[PDB]
Design a protein around this motif. Sequence first.
Motif, PDB file in Angstrom:
ATOM      1  N   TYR A  19      43.909  37.988  77.638  1.00 18.64           N
ATOM      2  CA  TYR A  19      43.225  37.327  78.758  1.00 18.64           C
ATOM      3  C   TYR A  19      43.749  37.776  80.143  1.00 18.64           C
ATOM      4  O   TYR A  19      44.963  37.882  80.351  1.00 18.64           O
ATOM      5  N   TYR A  50      36.673  35.834  77.253  1.00 19.11           N
ATOM      6  CA  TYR A  50      37.545  36.682  78.115  1.00 19.11           C
ATOM      7  C   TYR A  50      36.805  37.837  78.789  1.00 19.11           C
ATOM      8  O   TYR A  50      37.340  38.468  79.699  1.00 19.11           O
ATOM      9  N   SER A 113      37.431  26.080  70.550  1.00 13.74           N
ATOM     10  CA  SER A 113      37.706  24.762  71.078  1.00 13.74           C
ATOM     11  C   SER A 113      36.879  23.773  70.309  1.00 13.74           C
ATOM     12  O   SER A 113      35.792  24.098  69.888  1.00 13.74           O
TER      13      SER A 113
END
Length: 304
Positions: A19, A50, A113
Motif C-alpha cells: 500500500y 490499493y 473487511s
Amino acid sequence: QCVKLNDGHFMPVLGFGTYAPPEVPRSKALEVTKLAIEAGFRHIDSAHLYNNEEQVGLAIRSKIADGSVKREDIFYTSKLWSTFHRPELVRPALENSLKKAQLDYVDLYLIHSPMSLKPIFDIVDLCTTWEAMEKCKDAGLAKSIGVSNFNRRQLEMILNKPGLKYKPVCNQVECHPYFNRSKLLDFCKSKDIVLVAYSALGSQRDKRWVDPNSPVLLEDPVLCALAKKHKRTPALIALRYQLQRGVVVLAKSYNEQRIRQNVQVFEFQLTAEDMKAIDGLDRNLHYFNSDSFASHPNYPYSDE
Ligand SMILES: NC(=O)c1ccc[n+]([C@@H]2O[C@H](COP(=O)([O-])OP(=O)(O)OC[C@H]3O[C@@H](n4cnc5c(N)ncnc54)[C@H](OP(=O)(O)O)[C@@H]3O)[C@@H](O)[C@H]2O)c1
Ligand SMILES: COc1ccc2cc([C@H](C)C(=O)O)ccc2c1
C-alpha cells in the motif's frame, strides 16, 4: 521460512506490504516490489483497493521472466473490496484483480473487511459472501481464502456456518505492540487460523484515518532499548516479536535500504524477557480510528 495453512498450502511468514497513498506515483509499486523480491520477500500483499495490482503483478511477472523466482515461489495476496460483498459480485471481483495483475491465480484471496458498502453502508449476509469465496477456491482462482479485519464473533459466524466447506486460512488484522490482539490470536491458534499482522510497524499514519497525536510505535523507548541491546532497529524488533508469537507479519517500505533491512528479521531472536517487555506495551490502541469505520454496524472494534 513458511507456515502450513489449514488447507495444506504454505505461506511465507514475512510479507511485503504494497500500500502507498495516491500521492505516491503508481510506478513506485512496480519498483519497490521488484526490490522486495530481490531482497528475499516471497509474500506480496495487495488488494483491489490499493490501485496497484497492475504494477505489483508486473513486478512479480518481471521477476519470473528474468529468472530470479518461479511463480510457485511467490505467495501473492489480493482482497475483495467491501462494495463487492454481494455473493454474485465476488468471483467477477477476483477475476478483475487477476486480469489486472495478469496472473492465473492468487495464492490468497480475502474478504478485505466485514463492513459492507453499497455496490453509505450495506447489509449483507457474509456467510453468502464466504460461499462465493469457497467456489473461487474450487475453481482454482485462489489457492486459499481468508478474511481480514474480522473480530472473534465475525470469525465465529463463518466457522459455525451450516455445511462450511473451507475455514478461512487466516485473519489479517491490525496488530503491533500497542494493540497485540493476544485474545484474538489465542482464538485463531485454537482454530488453526493464522493471524496475519498489518501495520506491524505503526501504520503509515495516514491523515485520513490516523490521529497524528497518536504515539509513534517505532519511537517507543522499550523498542528502542531492545534495538540497542540486539544492535538491530526498532522495526526489526517489532517484526521479530510477531514471528515469535506465531503471527505472520507484513512490512511495508518503499525505501530501498529499509526493504533490505527488514529481511534481517530472520537473523536474530528475542529472549523470553524481551518478549514479556514487548507484551507489556499493549494498550488497546488501534491506529485506524475513524468516523468512516466507527459508525458502521459491523465495525470490528465494537466487541472490545
Ligand atoms: N487488510 C487491511 O485492511 C490492511 C490495512 C492496513 C495495511 N494493510 C497491509 O499491510 C501493509 C503494511 O502495513 P502499513 O502499510 O500500515 O505499514 P507498516 O508495515 O506498519 O509500515 C509503516 C512505516 O514503517 C516504515 N518502515 C518500514 N521498514 C522500516 C524500517 N526498517 N525502519 C523504519 N521504518 C520502516 C515504512 O516507511 P517507508 O516506506 O518510508 O520505509 C512504513 O510507511 C500495507 O501496505 C498493506 O499491504 C492491510
Ligand atoms: C477496521 O476496519 C478496517 C480498518 C482499517 C482498514 C485499513 C485499510 C487500508 C486501505 C489497507 O491498507 O488495506 C482498509 C480497510 C480497513 C478496514
